[PDB]
Scaffold this motif. Structure first.
Motif, mmCIF file in Angstrom:
data_model
loop_
_atom_site.group_PDB
_atom_site.id
_atom_site.type_symbol
_atom_site.label_atom_id
_atom_site.label_comp_id
_atom_site.label_asym_id
_atom_site.label_seq_id
_atom_site.Cartn_x
_atom_site.Cartn_y
_atom_site.Cartn_z
ATOM 1 N N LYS A 1 0.835 -1.228 0.142
ATOM 2 C CA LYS A 1 -0.304 0.150 0.029
ATOM 3 C C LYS A 1 0.728 1.391 0.048
ATOM 4 O O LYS A 1 0.505 2.304 -0.527
ATOM 5 C CB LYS A 1 -0.919 0.032 1.244
ATOM 6 N N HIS B 1 0.973 4.122 -2.908
ATOM 7 C CA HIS B 1 0.479 5.458 -2.468
ATOM 8 C C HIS B 1 1.789 6.343 -2.843
ATOM 9 O O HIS B 1 1.532 7.555 -3.344
ATOM 10 C CB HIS B 1 0.491 5.716 -1.027
ATOM 11 N N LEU C 1 -7.220 7.922 -5.774
ATOM 12 C CA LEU C 1 -7.211 8.538 -4.410
ATOM 13 C C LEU C 1 -8.216 7.687 -3.470
ATOM 14 O O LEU C 1 -8.032 7.432 -2.346
ATOM 15 C CB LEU C 1 -7.406 10.076 -4.497
ATOM 16 N N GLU C 2 -9.492 7.462 -4.211
ATOM 17 C CA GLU C 2 -10.517 6.710 -3.560
ATOM 18 C C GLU C 2 -10.003 5.369 -3.188
ATOM 19 O O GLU C 2 -10.273 4.686 -2.155
ATOM 20 C CB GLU C 2 -11.748 6.513 -4.493
ATOM 21 N N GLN D 1 -7.624 5.407 -0.464
ATOM 22 C CA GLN D 1 -8.331 5.815 0.945
ATOM 23 C C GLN D 1 -8.884 4.457 1.338
ATOM 24 O O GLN D 1 -8.848 4.119 2.721
ATOM 25 C CB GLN D 1 -9.482 6.785 0.730
ATOM 26 N N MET E 1 -6.255 2.288 2.655
ATOM 27 C CA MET E 1 -5.743 2.800 4.122
ATOM 28 C C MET E 1 -6.853 2.608 5.169
ATOM 29 O O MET E 1 -6.299 2.323 6.262
ATOM 30 C CB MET E 1 -5.313 4.107 3.945
ATOM 31 N N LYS E 2 -7.994 2.656 4.961
ATOM 32 C CA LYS E 2 -8.988 2.430 5.965
ATOM 33 C C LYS E 2 -9.129 0.939 6.302
ATOM 34 O O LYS E 2 -9.288 0.477 7.414
ATOM 35 C CB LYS E 2 -10.386 2.494 5.402
#
Lengths: 688, 708
Positions: free
Chosen positions: A78, A82, A598-599, A602, A605-606
């Motif tokens: 990840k 990123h 980006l979605e 995110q 990451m969540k």
């Protein structure tokens, strides 16, 4: 007569009372042992349950650790994703900036082109705002004008030709300048791209240098930890040598137990004596040790028989050996009086060189002095090592001669020496605790050594990672050098292009000055022509428009060419606007892709944060449960240690009680049977 | 009075019955002792197996932790490879999506450009037709408008008239000016020739630059790639060697610990009087000069004996197992003196320099009736060089089948006698013997363990030396790879700098040559103009001089002037009509033609960029597909290997645990059985002792009765 019977009866009554007391004690000890066995069974059951719980907790902890480790790999992936997304976003921002600058420039150029086109159209509109007899008059008018200014017209034609040549040169120079400008614009775009790449490379190199510094610090910390572990291992090795000295003291206590076992074999021999006739015993007490001179000496030389036994008959020796086999007593050495006859007559008293002879320093009665003079042989004692060597090596006789302190030479010439400072010690029960402490310390040291080995493996892995990082840094440095060389080449090319453009402009300045001079000359010629036309006007009542077949027609053709050039410029501006629109569409597609990325980032990451939170909660719960289980297991282990100590004490008490009971039973067999024998003897006497 | 005799006979019968009962109890005790010996052998075997099982548990458990760490590292590497394969698959999917999208865009752009080009092909079918006409009209205007100007000038010149000529002066202009034109032609000769020389120089420079532009770089890159691959393989081999060396060091440490434990167990047996002596003689040996290796250690390690009679040896050996042999007596004396704060006990030395009093011994085994007798020297493996000392120890120690026969032969010949079961007799008249348990002189048994430990230590030292050599070789290989990479990079950088300098020089020289070629074309145009001017001069001024050389009248001249004026008017009208039609056609067609050209220009640049991007993407996709296939194959192989290793480790751990549990259960059962057997044996021994006491009392009573 009856007094012996009364004494035997009293002794039997006392023995019976003692046996009853011992039986009561043994019953109490057996009950206590049964209770302790039940307690131990319960304790081991609880320990097994606790071990199963701890195994389950350890399995859960290992599962959680593996899940987290896989989480480390997912987190690394990840992070890479990123980083790629951030690089793409930075590239998109740099694009947006450059594209916006280019779009502003293109909009300004389009506005300028539109204004120029409008001005040209206005000028054309302003510009786009002669007979039979008149032609007859114009014939003579033109004839006179030619006759007057043929030279002027020729000069005007030459000026026009020169102006056309200068205009051709000016357009050639303008085309060259435009080509240089386009090359400069392309080089500027390439330089901007190369500068963005170089900035990215510099950021990557700074990050790599920071990572290398962090890895070097971590490797230094690991090396310091390894050195501290090695120092602690050396300290623990010194402590383990000290603990092995305590183990050595425990071995000496076991040596004392072995000496006690040797003592036991001798009252067994004494039992044989009570069972066999005319036995003497051990030789330790059959020697004179008074005067504190060469006292140990003899014992050393006489050691082989110094622990042997004297018996009557060799047949008695064989039957004693058979008894030893039957009742598993032990092993010893026997000298029977029926075989000593071999070497009795060796009672010589030759020259002693003023030195003491062995037999002289021993207490005796006839057959013991026979035995000792037989075993000793030619044993002699000297004062010092030098004296012994002088009295032995210088002489051609070899025998068993010993020094006062112990140094001896054997009958075959074995030179020997040695003396020990004995330290009588006990405290085996204290040693039981010291031995346990030493074992615990050894286990701790082994665990520390395993931890140090794991740390060394981790350090080796870190060293390999550092080597890989150094290789990557070298590659990055090479790439940076290549980028710097490319940037320098681009800068040199740009400088050369700028110099060439400056030279061309300097030449264009001269061309423009020449064009201006030609225009001034043409204006003077036009003024002369206007003067001629005005002079001809004295008879006239036009000409510039009449030859609009040629003058204004050529002007309109030039205006149409200029309008076509303006339309071409407008089309080029439209093409630039289309390029800007295509770049904006590409940027909008990039914006959509970046929003999707980006979605996704995110969401990832969540998910990673939720997984990390769940793993942390599970790890905390498992740690709390394992701490509680470890406290319970420590309490259970303390209870089990107490139970084991109680069981050992009970076993010792039971062993003592069993020994006492065996002694009492032997006495009863030696007393009750003695009483029966006395009664039988009395009955036999009464037969008379 | 014979009742006393009857009582004595009854007592004798009772003693015989007691002896028979003792024999029966001895048979029962012999059966129980055989059972107990079997149980004790099984218990010793189980204790050895359990010590080995615990040592294996610890050592192979560290090894299995390392193997599980390696399997987890392989699984993490496979997971990283799968993540990289997924990243490459995502990159390929993005590349394919870009291919599809940009290819639809390129197809649309190509369709638009082809429609524009087809219209422009029709535009040329039209633009060429318009051109031909426009060029013809322009040529006519040059041949008419310029012709009109020339005719006007000629008429003006003819207007001047002098009866009393100026043509000669014009001839001077026809000659001098033309001569000046010839000088200009000389400038053309000095420029056209100079232009040709410059063109030749530029061609030579271009050929030289193209020669360098052309191999070596590709070979250097391939060599660098091969060196990098070799370095990676060497690094992998070094890592494998590191793991092997770590495992070897761990097992060597475990073996050293086991050897220390065995040495402690062996030392636990000897009397400390001589244990401290051994210790002291040791540290003195490693303290003082023992360079000639005079110390030969204890007797045990220098001789081995056939196991069948090993017990005998030990019982006849005793302290003699610890004899030390030294080269020189003086060394022994100096060592003994150096025990000058003696903290240890008994210690013996046998000098080889003065080794004597080893009298010759002849064995009477030649005759018959010595089959029962077995010389012990026949069962010993030893270094011949020490025979005398060995003979002093085990020579003259004989082995007999019967103790009585042994004593008889000892009396006949002075030799120490002993039985196979351990009934040691003395030649000097003493007798020795006793029961012996399973414990014995374990130093000889432990001598083999010590030798094995020393061999293992030597093997571990050799492995450590090999590991150090491998590490040095790996460091040297890494340094060589780094140096080769640096040299290749430096050579490539130098080649690239030379190529960039050559390319910049080529670009500058090509711009200069293009400027020179443009100047040469301009000079050629100027020379053509000068030739045309010279021809016009020779045709006008020379012709006028020739004609007038052979009037002041212009009748034919006047007619020519009138015709020229009419032609000028006609040419003006025709030029107006032409210009009009040409301008209309231009506004109609050339505007759209230029618009299409401009659109194709940016369109052409976009198409070129798209084509370059597509080619790069295709190459990258092919490379990524190949790399992904290779990575997938490697990951599959690694996963299979890791699964096999994990299964093997799990099976080994399960087997070890099962064996440990079974050994513990067997040990507990054996301990219980041994306790029961010991209790039974103690009861039997107590009964036997009571019977013996009763027999002794009965014998005493019988003797007392017979005294009368």
């Amino acid at each position: 007569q009856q007094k012996e019977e009364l004494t035997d009866k009293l002794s039997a009554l006392n023995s019976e009372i003692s046996s009853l007391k011992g039986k009561i004690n043994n019953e109490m000890k057996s009950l206590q042992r049964s209770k302790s066995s039940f307690v131990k069974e319960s304790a081991v059951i609880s320990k097994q349950k606790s071990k199963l719980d701890y195994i389950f907790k350890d399995k859960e902890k290992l599962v959680s650790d593996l899940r987290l480790i896989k989480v480390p790999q997912q987190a690394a992936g990840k992070r890479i994703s990123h980083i790629e997304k951030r690089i793409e976003s930075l590239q998109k921002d740099l694009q947006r900036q450059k594209t916006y600058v280019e779009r502003f420039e293109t909009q300004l150029k389009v506005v300028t082109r539109s204004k120029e086109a409008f001005e040209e159209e206005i000028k054309q509109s302003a510009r786009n705002y002669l007979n039979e007899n008149d032609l007859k008059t114009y014939n003579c008018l033109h004839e006179k004008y030619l006759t007057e200014g043929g030279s002027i017209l020729e000069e005007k034609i030459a000026v026009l030709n020169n102006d056309k040549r200068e205009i051709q040169e000016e357009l050639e120079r303008f085309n060259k300048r435009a080509d240089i400008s386009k090359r400069r614009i392309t080089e500027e775009l390439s330089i901007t791209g190369e500068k963005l790449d170089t900035q990215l490379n510099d950021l990557r190199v700074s990050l790599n240098e920071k990572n290398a510094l962090h890895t070097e610090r971590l490797h230094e910390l690991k090396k310091l930890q390894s050195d501290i572990e090695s120092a602690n291992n050396q300290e623990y090795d010194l402590n383990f040598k000290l603990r092995e000295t305590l183990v050595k003291i425990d071995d000496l206590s076991a040596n004392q137990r072995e000496t006690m076992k040797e003592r036991k074999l001798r009252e067994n021999i004494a039992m044989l004596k009570r069972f066999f006739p005319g036995v003497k015993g051990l030789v330790h007490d059959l020697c004179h040790p008074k005067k504190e001179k060469y006292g140990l000496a003899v014992s050393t030389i006489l050691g082989k028989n110094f622990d042997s036994v004297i018996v009557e008959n060799l047949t008695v020796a064989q039957e004693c050996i058979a008894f030893l086999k039957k009742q598993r007593a032990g092993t010893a050495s026997f000298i029977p009086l029926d075989t000593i006859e071999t070497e009795l007559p060796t009672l010589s008293l030759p020259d002693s060189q003023d030195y003491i002879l062995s037999i002289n320093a021993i207490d005796y009665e006839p057959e013991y002095e026979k035995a000792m003079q037989y075993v000793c042989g030619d044993s002699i004692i000297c004062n010092t090592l030098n004296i012994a060597k002088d009295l032995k090596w210088k002489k051609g006789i070899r025998g068993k001669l010993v020094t006062i302190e112990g140094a001896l030479i054997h009958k075959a010439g074995l030179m020997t020496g040695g003396i020990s400072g004995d330290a009588n010690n006990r405290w085996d029960k204290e040693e039981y605790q010291s031995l346990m402490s030493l074992k615990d310390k050894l286990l701790i040291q082994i665990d520390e050594l395993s931890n140090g080995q794991r740390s060394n493996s981790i350090r080796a892995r870190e060293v390999e990672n550092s080597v890989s990082l150094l290789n990557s840094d070298i590659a990055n440095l090479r790439t940076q050098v290549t980028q710097q060389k490319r940037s320098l080449d681009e800068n040199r090319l740009e400088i050369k292009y700028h110099n060439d453009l400056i030279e061309k402009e300097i030449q264009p300045k001269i061309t423009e000055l020449k064009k201006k001079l030609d225009d001034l000359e043409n204006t003077k010629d036009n003024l002369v022509k206007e003067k001629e036309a005005l002079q001809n006007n004295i008879f006239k009542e036009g000409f510039t428009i009449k030859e609009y077949e040629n003058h204004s027609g050529e002007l309109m053709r030039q205006q149409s060419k200029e309008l076509q050039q303006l339309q071409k410029q407008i089309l080029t501006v439209e093409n630039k606007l289309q390029f800007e629109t295509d770049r904006l569409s590409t940027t909008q597609r990039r914006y959509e892709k970046a929003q999707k990325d980006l979605e996704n980032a995110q969401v990832e990451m969540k998910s990673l944060e939720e997984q990390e939170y769940a793993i942390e909660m599970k790890i905390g719960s498992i740690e709390s449960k394992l701490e509680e289980h470890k406290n319970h297991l420590d309490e259970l282990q303390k209870k089990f240690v107490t139970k084991q100590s109680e069981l050992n004490s009970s076993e010792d008490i039971l062993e003592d009680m069993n020994s006492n009971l065996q002694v009492l039973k032997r006495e009863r067999d030696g007393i009750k049977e003695d009483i029966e024998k006395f009664d039988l003897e009395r009955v036999t006497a009464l037969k008379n | 009075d014979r009742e006393l005799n009857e009582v004595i006979n009854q007592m004798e019968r009772l003693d015989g019955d007691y002896n028979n009962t003792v024999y029966s109890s001895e048979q029962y005790i012999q059966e129980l002792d055989k059972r107990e010996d079997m149980i004790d052998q099984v218990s010793k075997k189980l204790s050895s197996i359990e010590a080995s099982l615990k040592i294996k548990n610890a050592t192979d458990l560290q090894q299995a932790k390392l193997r599980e760490s390696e399997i987890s590292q392989k699984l993490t590497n496979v997971n990283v490879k799968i993540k990289d394969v997924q990243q490459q698959i995502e990159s390929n999917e993005e590349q394919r999506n870009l291919d599809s999208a940009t290819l639809k865009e390129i197809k649309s752009i190509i369709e638009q450009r082809k429609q524009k080009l087809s219209k422009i092909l029709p535009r040329y079918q039209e633009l060429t037709k318009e051109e031909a006409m426009y060029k013809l009209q322009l040529a006519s205007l040059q041949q008419k408008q310029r012709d009109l100007i020339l005719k006007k000038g000629e008429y003006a010149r003819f207007k001047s008239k002098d009866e009393r000529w100026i043509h000669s002066e014009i001839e001077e202009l026809k000659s001098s000016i033309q001569n000046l034109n010839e000088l200009e032609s000389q400038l053309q000769m000095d420029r056209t020739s100079l232009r040709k020389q410059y063109s030749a120089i530029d061609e030579e420079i271009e050929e030289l630059i193209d020669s360098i532009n052309g191999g070596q770089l590709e070979d250097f890159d391939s060599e660098l790639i091969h060196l990098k691959q070799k370095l990676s393989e060497s690094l992998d081999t070094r890592k494998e060697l590191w793991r092997k060396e770590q495992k070897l060091q761990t097992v060597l440490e475990t073996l050293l610990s086991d050897v220390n434990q065995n040495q402690r167990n062996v030392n636990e047996t000897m009397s400390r009087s001589l244990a401290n002596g051994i210790i002291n003689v040791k540290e003195i040996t490693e303290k003082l000069k023992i360079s000639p290796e005079s110390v030969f250690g204890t007797l045990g390690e220098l001789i081995k004996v056939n196991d069948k009679y090993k017990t005998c040896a030990e019982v006849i050996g005793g302290n003699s197992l610890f004899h030390i042999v030294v080269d020189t007596e003086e060394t022994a004396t100096l060592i003994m003196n150096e025990l000058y704060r003696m903290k240890g006990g008994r210690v013996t030395f046998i000098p080889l320099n003065r080794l004597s009093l080893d009298s010759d011994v002849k064995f009477p085994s030649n005759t018959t009736t010595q089959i029962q007798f077995t010389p012990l020297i026949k069962k010993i493996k030893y270094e011949p060089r020490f025979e005398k000392a060995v003979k002093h120890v085990f020579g003259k120690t004989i082995v007999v089948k019967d103790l009585g026969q042994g004593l008889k032969l000892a009396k006949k010949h002075k030799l120490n006698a002993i039985t196979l079961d351990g009934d040691r007799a003395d030649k000097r008249g003493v007798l020795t013997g006793g029961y012996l348990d399973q414990h014995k002189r374990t130093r000889l048994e432990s001598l083999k363990n010590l030798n094995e430990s020393r061999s293992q230590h030597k093997k571990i030292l050799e492995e450590l030396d090999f590991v150090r050599n491998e590490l040095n070789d790996i460091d040297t290989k890494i340094d060589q790879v780094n140096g080769n990479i640096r040299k290749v990079s430096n050579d490539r950088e130098s080649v690239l700098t030379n190529i960039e300098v050559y390319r910049t020089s080529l670009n500058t020289k090509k711009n200069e040559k293009l400027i020179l070629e443009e100047s040469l074309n301009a000079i050629i145009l100027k020379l053509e103009k000068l030739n045309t001017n010279r021809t016009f001069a020779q045709e006008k001024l020379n012709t006028f001089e020739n004609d007038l050389l052979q009037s002041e009248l212009s009748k034919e001249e006047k007619e020519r002037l009138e015709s020229l004026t009419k032609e000028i008017s006609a040419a003006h009208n025709k030029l107006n009509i032409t210009s009009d039609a040409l301008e209309g056609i231009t506004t109609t067609i050339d505007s759209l033609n230029a618009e299409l050209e401009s659109k194709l220009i940016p369109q052409e640049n976009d198409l070129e960029s798209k084509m370059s991007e597509v080619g790069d993407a295709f190459i990258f996709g092919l490379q990524d597909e190949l790399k992904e296939l290779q990575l997938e194959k490697e990951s599959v192989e690694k996963q299979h290997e890791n699964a096999v290793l994990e299964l093997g480790t799990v099976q080994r751990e399960i087997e070890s645990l099962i064996a440990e549990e079974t050994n513990n259960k067997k040990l507990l059962e054996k301990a219980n059985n041994q306790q029961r057997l010991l209790l039974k044996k103690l009861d039997n021994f107590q009964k036997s002792v009571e019977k013996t006491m009763i027999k002794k009392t009965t014998l005493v009573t019988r003797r007392e009765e017979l005294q009368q």
